[PDB]
């Protein structure tokens, strides 16, 4: 299963 | 031993404010998923027969997760353009890896999360899975960003959660493709090298998984320090190749022996050139 | 930062004259991800060229395996041409049926 970013660079 | 990764990529390329996105996803190594921005369709894909078993809304979640992905690397490598101090006219690259190892013990060993600017060192998620570590100058303002917003909880409970859970499902699934193995279809040629000097190929065929050892034996002592070693690569159809050369003197070829060394090799094959 | 790639080409079975076969390009450890690769037979490109997958390894150089069908013969030869930012040059590989 994928991974979501939670927070921008 | 068994893992889990997700190997993320964006491009900007110049001119297009849009960044290619490709994410692959690997069980074992073995690529399962894939998803490119650059087609005609943009979803996520099985790339292996055992995905057939997830259904319709497992690949939509999937693709808008990317979607949501893809805004993420577009508005990172606009804030990297920055840290840098970098000139919009060219082409960048924001690449990740994240996921999990799992020991013997089929638990959690190891989570997984490492990110690249210019194919360079950016930032990374400790084993701890608690702290960051920055490559540099740049790399500090997100790392104080991150240490904050409590970032590093998130990432921690992806890696030791749902990671963990559909890797354990994949492993169910695709057990019968996984954990088989082809062993290699090993073989010895015979070639010119210079005058009064022959070459000896000891050639590895079909075989899987990609880990492999090939020995080329004197007088019962490996020849390490006198050994052409090509690196392994895909036959295409989810096999691997390999193959290890020595030069021997003309004539005086029989006295050389090659080893082969597989995880589906109960015992390790011996060859010999045949005249 | 640029890295050069790395250029294997290959059969995906021993070669034998008048019987198809599939050629392959395993491009590697390269940087930026854009590259243009071709594979010739006697110096034209081989139509309907089909691009594995664009991919990167654990050190962050990317890679990817283009492949063909191909009937290799005594007098024909093969090629992969690879231009990549790194070089000043396209780089052209030979296929030989020992390698």
């Given at each position: ?8 660079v | ?124 998620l ?17 790392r ?79 020849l ?52 | 930062?640029?890295?050069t790639?790395?250029?294997?080409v ?66 024909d ?5 690879v ?17």
């Amino acid at each position: 299963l994928s991974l979501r970013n939670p927070i921008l660079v | 031993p068994h893992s889990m990764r997700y190997f993320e990529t964006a491009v900007s390329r110049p001119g297009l404010e849009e960044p290619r996105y490709i994410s692959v996803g690997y069980v074992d190594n073995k690529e399962f998923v894939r998803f490119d921005s650059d087609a005609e369709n943009p979803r996520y894909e099985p790339r292996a027969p055992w995905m057939e078993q997830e259904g319709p809304e497992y690949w939509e979640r999937e693709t808008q997760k990317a979607k949501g992905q893809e805004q993420w690397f577009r508005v990172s490598l606009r804030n990297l353009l920055g840290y840098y101090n970098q000139s919009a006219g060219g082409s960048h690259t924001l690449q990740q890896m994240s996921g999990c190892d799992l020991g013997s013990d089929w638990r959690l060993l190891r989570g997984y999360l490492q990110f690249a600017y210019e194919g360079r060192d950016y930032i990374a998620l400790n084993e701890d899975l608690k702290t960051w570590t920055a490559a540099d100058m740049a790399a500090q303002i997100t790392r104080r960003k991150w240490e904050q917003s409590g970032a590093a909880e998130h990432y921690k409970a992806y890696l030791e959660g749902e990671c963990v859970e559909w890797l354990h499902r994949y492993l169910k699934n695709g057990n019968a493709t996984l954990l088989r193995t082809d062993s290699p279809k090993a073989h010895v040629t015979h070639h010119p090298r210079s005058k009064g000097e022959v070459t000896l190929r000891c050639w590895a065929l079909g075989f899987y998984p990609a880990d492999i050892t090939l020995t080329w034996q004197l007088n019962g002592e490996e020849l390490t320090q006198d050994m052409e070693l090509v690196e392994t690569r895909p036959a295409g159809d989810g096999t691997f190749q390999k193959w290890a050369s020595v030069v021997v003197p003309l004539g005086k070829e029989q006295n050389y022996t090659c080893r082969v060394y597989h995880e589906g090799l109960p015992e390790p094959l011996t060859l010999r050139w045949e005249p | 930062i640029q890295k050069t790639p790395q250029i294997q080409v290959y059969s995906r079975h021993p070669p034998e004259n008048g019987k198809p076969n599939i050629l392959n390009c395993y491009v590697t450890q390269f940087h930026p991800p854009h590259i243009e690769i071709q594979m010739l037979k006697n110096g034209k490109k081989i139509p309907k060229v089909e691009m594995s997958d664009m991919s990167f390894s654990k050190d962050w150089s990317f890679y990817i395996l283009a492949h063909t069908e191909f009937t290799p013969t005594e007098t024909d030869t093969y090629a992969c041409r690879v231009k990549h930012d790194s070089m000043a040059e396209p780089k052209t590989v030979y296929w030989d049926r020992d390698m």
